[PDB]
Amino acid sequence: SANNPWTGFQIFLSPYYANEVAAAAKQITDPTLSSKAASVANIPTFTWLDSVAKIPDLGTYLASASALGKSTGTKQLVQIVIYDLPDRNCAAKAVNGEFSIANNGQANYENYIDQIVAQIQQFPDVRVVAVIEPDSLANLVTNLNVQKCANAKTTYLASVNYALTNLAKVGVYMYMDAGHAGWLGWPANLSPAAQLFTQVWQNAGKSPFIKGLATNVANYNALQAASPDPITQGNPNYDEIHYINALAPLLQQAGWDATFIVDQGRSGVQNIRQQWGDWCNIKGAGFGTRPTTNTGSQFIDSIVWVKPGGESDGTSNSSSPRYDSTCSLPDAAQPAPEAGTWFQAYFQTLVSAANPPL
């Protein structure tokens, strides 16, 4: 499109990831690998607002970005993930997230959005790009037979609508999470996906700030694969570019000339999964293509690093109340710590296996 949110902007670099990476890098013993690892702190990532407790951090990042732009003669851009739906991750095994549908979850989520909006409103010289609720809408396409998802459907739709409607009022550029090629990119899932995303876009007023969709978030697919990963057999859309090329025209026909961003933060190594649906701490992953607006596709505004490589997808300890058995599969790196916490051995391999090399 004409207006790529990133062009002309300096991305604010997460200080939390920089510190996590800094603490991680001094533990890497090989000096050549250590300096490569430290440099990852200079690669822009998304900050996940996975709880209300993260909202004050957003406030500090906006204020720091505002000052840094003035100090360097630049316009700054802060990258966030909205990730706190009630009954979050409905198809996952075991309960995740601080809000539940049964305990005023919708209302609590609205208050979470209101607190985010109230921060963003204070810093109008900073641009914000938000990924909206990974692992949410996509479940309403393919997983309505999952009872937790069926029971969450109206809440997910209302809560995502509230986020889109109210973040638009403070000019946030938004990409709704849309799964990945092996989820919604199956040809038979494309029209159901397009219908759902367009209804969501309509309910939120078709705001021009709703730019489009984010794909491959926290996943491992290629953007453009050299040859299809064996996990993809049966799906002609074997990488993200095929998925996006197929879905984008369906959205255009609805009057939404949608654009896309694609996570490549853990895509450096292909052909590492036994089944396409295996998502947790996949062993041997490497950092992939660094964020760039040089995407190779009319439909893609940016390659991004949404999931911060090195933070665990979930614990492998079956005694944890948060345990998801996907995290103990043969292709999952084990032992792994709780979701969101630092997984040092996994980070070191992401660095060693980076492609392109760091």
Contact partners, residue 199, CB within 8 Å, separation at least 6: none
Phi–psi pair at 14, nearest 5 degrees: -55, 120
Three-state DSSP string of 65-101:
HHHHHHHHCCCEEEEEEECCCCCCCCCCCCCCCCCCC
Q: What distance in Å separates the CA atoms of residue 206 and residue 73, rounded to the nearest whole number? A: 33
Q: How far apart are CA 294 and CA 305, in angstroms?
A: 14
> In degrees, to the nearest 5, what angle opens at C-alpha 256 toward C-alphas 289 and 132?
50
Region of 130 on the Ramachandran plot (φ > 0 left; ψ -120 to 50 alpha; else beta)? beta
Alpha helix locations (H) across 100-239? 105-120, 137-142, 147-168, 187-203
Cβ proximity of 312 and 284 under 8 Å: no
135 among known catalytic residues: yes
Q: Which residue has the tokens 């539940």?
A: 100
334: which 2 tokens?
């084990």
Exactly one of 229, 239, 301, 313 is catalytic; which is it? 313
Q: Which of 135, 177, 278, 324 is catalytic?
A: 135
Length of the chain: 358
Domains of the chain: 10-352 (3.20.20.40)
Alpha carbons 40 and 287: distance in angstroms, whole number: 9
What residues does 263 pair with on adjacent strands?
304
Question: What does the DSSP assignment read for 31-49?
Answer: HHHHHHHHHGGGS--PEEE
Residues 290 and 309: their CA atoms lie apart, in Å, by 12
Q: How far is CA 154 from CA 105, 150, 159, 177, in A?
A: 12, 8, 8, 17
Identify how the structure was determined. X-ray
Token pair of 191, please? 């029209």
Give, in order, the Cα–Cα distances in Å from 141 to each of 33, 168, 185, 197.
42, 24, 11, 10
CA 344 to each of CA 63, 89, 158, 311, 316: distance values in angstroms, whole numbers, following the listed order:
30, 25, 38, 8, 15
Note if 278 is an active site residue: no
